[PDB]
Nucleic acid binder design. Structure first.
Length: 833
DNA sequence: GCCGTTTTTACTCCCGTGAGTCGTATTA
DNA sequence: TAATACGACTCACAAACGGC
RNA sequence: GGGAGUAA
């Protein structure tokens, strides 16, 4: 019969899934996963002489092998890699992939098609040949289940990995090119056409589908979906999350290369693995009540939800029959029409997203309990693998709710109303007042739960669907009592995740204070404190500032507005917390003045002109630059202690990524180094960067010419000293932050009886009954890390040491601790995280 | 010393070329 | 060796930081 | 390379 490993790896997941939950859902689970793919093949036979192309291709492949074997010397690079599969399947993939690249894309460059074929003809190995054998399972005919499978009881045919495209990026292209070369013989199905021959930045070799096939023609994107059963625990670097062995396994760390992942194989980080597995084991379910509303309201032509764009396409106005001649005809309406294209696009992009979020919610709607596998980026931060996530937008989060609930009232009912207030535009005011807001609108609520389609008050709120999810849940308590079991996730977000951490690692105060780390009766709005200082400088320039100038650069001449002009324009608009909102955050991520100009222009200026409320900004970019200057000055005196901390990190990474120099001698005393540090819970994070190099292949295409594609080399080279310096600072806070969230979960859980979690990087959600403990757990775990590892001191110890000499004189060193009592956070009401 | 280029990471979603020449690793 | 493929190298259609 | 969305 068959043979070779794979029979067991395809049977074990099904068998174990059919023992605990029955062959019922064990059949559906695999079909839903393998449904990548399974629909992708169904999309190919669609679409789908062919009964003449396949036999012609197979015949060529076999003849080509005979020609190569007869000749002497070095055999084509693609030859030996193409002898791994049966020639019949080699042809099959070539037809599939070439069609897939040309149908859903309008180009298409040769080095993209060849790469896609090479990757497909690799697994293969691999993962493809298994697909056919694993596909048999779900196409045959035709509790306690929400239990995680024991990691030690898992077969070795599930532990393995290889989540990176093996072979040499080069070797993968060779395979594809030779396949296309054999695909153009015989038949060819596709034509190789030269594009822009001569232009340095436009010359390319693109594959064109033959006109005969184009007239004979007939994502998103079922590769990563939620799990119906608890995901496989992460034991090693690869294999965790999903169960099927017919697919390529997931990587614990999403890296740029295979080598970067392989640096984790033998590290030993129990606190990192434990955190991911607990977060991964969180049982979720679709919020039926919210889903029933989302299916109806999104269908409306004029939805109550603001962000909800057309619909209404809005045509191009108007061409006043003037042609014509001359500066009246084309200026105007050219500029007026250009404004419409961007108006519709910013609508189009927002609508296309909306369409996808609903299609995804509809797919995973029904079903008892549903699960989501969890990954991490190259840093600490935890991500849900599937497209449909509890980490998505308002609607997506509203459509979801936890499966297992704990009853419930008195303690939980208090924070349930707090979450309700948070969903609305009420989250920067004391808790007793938040409770008051809910108790005042008892008539507004209940009625929205009565008839949500008739009463659209919840739609006007800050988080429409999430507030609606609270409304149905709030009404449930009023009718059943304080025994009414609830499972709505109550989110707890850190005021400003970043400045909070910088204030914690360097014992700020001042800063935060400002970011709600200390217990206060009033909510500390750091974005409002900066805006207060901005408005203070803004008023100063209004009466005493610079006048308008004419720079006359060459008509051509333009007016450069003075500080008096811009001050008046901003005062006639109202500079609030939202104007400086993103600017205050981005700085805490190593941003500069020029960078703020781009932010304010995108977040404040442009949308104001688009809304017809930005007629003040006569010179939009000069106005964005002026505001960027005001923030840079005002925020600096706000995160002082923070600035130095960043400058200490920036200097550390700058000198680590720097290449050594000597007196006329090219002495390599020290190479460029990757910035490395370990975050509190044990997660290691490296911030390296290799010099990006480009190589060219020499391929005698069809014996006519030499196809030489410049490709991005996967082969490692020299350490990029510039990125090593510019990346050392960020990566630091990155990793740390990542672990933080991870630590939170573990701790909280292990301690209290909290089983379910809703994690959005710095947001913490759980059932109302366990909300009180989580609200306390987030505090304890952050107070446990610092002190307990002095992030800054711990980070300093990592590169102690790694500094050369005549470098430590340029590395200060060290942000002093303030007078903040870490225990006060436990008493702080408005620091939700 | 002068000139040119660039200005948090990552992930997800949507909408440079062949020819000429040469060395070399490979196999009947 | 004698023949075969192909990679490797070259040539021609506003302020600050890093590289040449 | 560009655009959109989400998270820090």
């Amino acid at each position: 019969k068959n043979d070779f490993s794979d029979i067991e790896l395809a049977a074990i997941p099904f068998n174990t899934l059919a023992d605990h939950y029955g062959e019922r859902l064990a059949r559906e689970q695999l079909a839903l996963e393998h449904e990548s793919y399974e629909m992708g093949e169904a999309r190919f036979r669609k679409m789908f002489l062919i009964t003449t192309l396949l036999p012609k291709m197979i015949a060529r492949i076999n003849d080509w092998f005979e020609e190569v074997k007869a000749k002497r010397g070095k055999r084509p690079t693609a030859f030996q890699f193409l002898q791994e599969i049966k020639p019949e399947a080699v042809a099959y993939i070539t037809i599939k992939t070439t069609l897939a690249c040309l149908t859903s894309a309008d180009n298409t460059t040769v080095q993209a098609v060849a790469s896609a074929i090479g990757r497909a003809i690799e697994d293969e190995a691999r993962f493809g040949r298994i697909r056919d054998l694993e596909a048999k399972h779900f196409k045959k005919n035709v509790k306690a289940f929400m239990q995680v499978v024991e990691a030690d009881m898992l077969s070795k045919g599930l532990l393995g990995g290889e989540a990176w495209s093996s072979w040499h990026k080069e070797d993968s292209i060779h395979v594809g090119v030779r396949c296309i070369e054999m695909l153009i013989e015989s038949t060819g199905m596709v034509s190789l056409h030269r594009q822009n021959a001569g232009v340095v930045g436009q010359d390319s070799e693109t594959i064109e589908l033959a006109p005969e096939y184009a007239e004979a023609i007939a994502g998103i994107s079922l590769m990563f979906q939620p799990c119906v059963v608890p995901p496989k625990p992460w034991t090693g670097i690869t294999g965790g999350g999903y169960w099927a062995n017919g697919r390529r396994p997931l990587a614990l760390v999403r890296t740029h290369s295979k080598k970067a992942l392989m640096r984790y194989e033998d590290v030993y980080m129990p606190e990192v693995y434990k955190a991911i597995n607990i977060a991964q084991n969180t049982a979720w379910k679709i919020n039926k009540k919210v889903l029933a509303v989302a299916n109806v309201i999104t269908k409306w032509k004029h939805c109550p939800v603001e962000d909800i764009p057309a619909i209404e396409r809005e045509e191009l106005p108007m061409k006043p029959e003037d042609i014509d001649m001359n500066p009246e005809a084309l200026t105007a309406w050219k500029r007026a029409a250009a404004a419409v294209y961007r108006k519709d696009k910013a609508r189009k992009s927002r609508r296309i997203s909306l369409e996808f979020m609903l299609e995804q919610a509809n797919k995973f709607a029904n079903h008892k309990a549903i699960w989501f596998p969890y990954n991490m980026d190259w840093r600490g931060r935890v991500y849900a693998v599937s497209m449909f996530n509890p980490q998505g937008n308002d609607m997506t989060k509203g459509l979801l709710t936890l499966a297992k609930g704990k009853p419930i009232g008195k303690e939980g009912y208090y924070w349930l109303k707090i979450h309700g207030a948070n969903c609305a535009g009420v989250d920067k005011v004391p808790f007793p007042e938040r409770i008051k807001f809910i108790e005042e609108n008892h008539e507004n609520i209940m009625a929205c739960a009565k008839s949500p389609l008739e009463n659209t008050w919840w739609a006007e709120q800050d988080s429409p669907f999430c507030f609606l999810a609270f409304c149905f849940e709030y009404a449930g308590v009023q009718h059943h009592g304080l025994s009414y079991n609830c499972s709505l996730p109550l989110a707890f977000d850190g005021s400003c995740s970043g400045i909070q951490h910088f204030s914690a690692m360097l014992r700020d105060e001042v800063g935060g204070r400002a970011v709600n780390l200390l217990p206060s009766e009033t909510v500390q709005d750091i974005y409002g404190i900066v805006a207060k200082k901005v408005n203070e400088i803004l008023q100063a320039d209004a009466i005493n500032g610079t006048d308008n100038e004419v720079v006359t650069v060459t008509i051509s001449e333009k007016v450069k507005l003075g500080t008096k002009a811009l001050a008046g324009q901003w005062l006639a608009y109202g500079v609030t917390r939202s104007v400086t909102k993103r600017s205050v955050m981005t700085l805490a991520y190593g941003s500069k003045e020029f960078g703020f100009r781009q932010q304010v222009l995108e977040d404040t200026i442009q949308p104001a002109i688009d809304s017809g409320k930005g007629l003040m900004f006569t010179q939009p970019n000069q106005a964005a630059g002026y505001m960027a200057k005001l923030i840079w000055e005002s925020v600096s005196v706000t995160v002082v202690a923070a600035v130095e901390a960043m400058n200490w990190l920036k200097s550390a990474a700058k000198l680590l990524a720097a290449e050594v120099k000597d007196k006329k001698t090219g002495e390599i005393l020290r190479k460029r180094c990757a910035v490395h540090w370990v975050t509190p819970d044990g997660f290691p994070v490296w911030q390296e960067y290799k010099k990006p190099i480009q190589t060219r292949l020499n391929l005698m295409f069809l014996g006519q010419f030499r196809l030489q594609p410049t490709i991005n080399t996967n082969k490692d080279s020299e350490i990029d000293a510039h990125k090593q310096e510019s990346g050392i600072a960020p990566n630091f806070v990155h990793s740390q932050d990542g672990s933080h969230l991870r630590k939170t979960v573990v701790w909280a859980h292990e301690k209290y009886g909290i089983e379910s979690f809703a994690l959005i990087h710095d947001s913490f959600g759980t059932i109302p009954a366990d909300a009180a403990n989580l609200f306390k757990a987030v505090r304890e775990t952050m107070v446990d890390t610092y002190e307990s590892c002095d992030v800054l001191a711990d980070f300093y110890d990592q590169f102690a040491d790694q500094l050369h000499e005549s470098q430590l004189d340029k590395m200060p060193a060290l942000p002093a601790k303030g007078n903040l009592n870490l225990r006060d956070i436990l008493e702080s009401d408005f620091a939700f995280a």
